[PDB]
Amino acid sequence: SPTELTEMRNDLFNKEKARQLSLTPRTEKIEVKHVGKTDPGTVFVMNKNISTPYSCAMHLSEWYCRKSILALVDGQPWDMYKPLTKSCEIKFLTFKDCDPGEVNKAYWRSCAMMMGCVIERAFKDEYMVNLVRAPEVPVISGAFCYDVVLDSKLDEWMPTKENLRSFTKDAHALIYKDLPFETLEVEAKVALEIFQHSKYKVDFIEEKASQNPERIVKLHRIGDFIDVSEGPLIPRTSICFQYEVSAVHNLQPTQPSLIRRFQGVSLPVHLRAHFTIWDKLLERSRK
């Protein structure tokens, strides 16, 4: 049953979070210097592991909270709700910046994960759905995509326009939920314990641990859904405005198993497009 699996995953996630929170040496203080064009040379004297970049923004203004998508900590991308660890330099990255490449990648990855959650919950109980991964496809491609392995029963099945609309409506419902993008930085063993069922997830965690000097991997939760991520994500689900699941394609080398590539396109509230321009983006994303 899917319900018990997600329940168990949530329990393990919560346990790990509690473990990480417990080892905090009694609200230690860190000095965080803000290095930006705006409000220069302001220092935040904040909690060692409790405090987040979002709470730094909360110290500055509402505008920072609203517009900031990522934090650059020591020149490294960092989630808004990801707790800080050490004394560091912080700046806030928005969509409107001269080089928002990191923000673009973060938004892209976040939308991919949202689509994954949607398509997991979408299918009936009798049918089997297995999520493979979210490939690091560029924004210039026009569509964020996710790889999924379905059951042998739906091999001959192709989704209708109405089915794609249903996925879209589920995604919009998830946007309306306004769920924060919870993050967790764990040792590989914990991730293996969580994702023991899905072999694809096992393999992906293994390679992610391999590329890192340590066995450190990143996990993200929206709501009862946990997924291992390539990099940092956007703060909140509500950031997305225009979200449509474009198309589904069967990958050509279907010798061992059949993998469906789910493709979709999204834009944030900050960068809303007109109806006409949006229609052009849809027609491209279907390819």
Binding site: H34, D39, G41, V43, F44, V45, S55
Partner: peptide
């Protein structure tokens, strides 16, 4: 012992003609 509250130490507030 550290305080529970997180504080902000404001930077130098500068007039338009002034340069950081």
């Amino acid at each position: 012992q550290p305080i529970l509250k997180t504080v902000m130490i404001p930077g130098p507030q500068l007039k338009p003609e002034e340069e950081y």
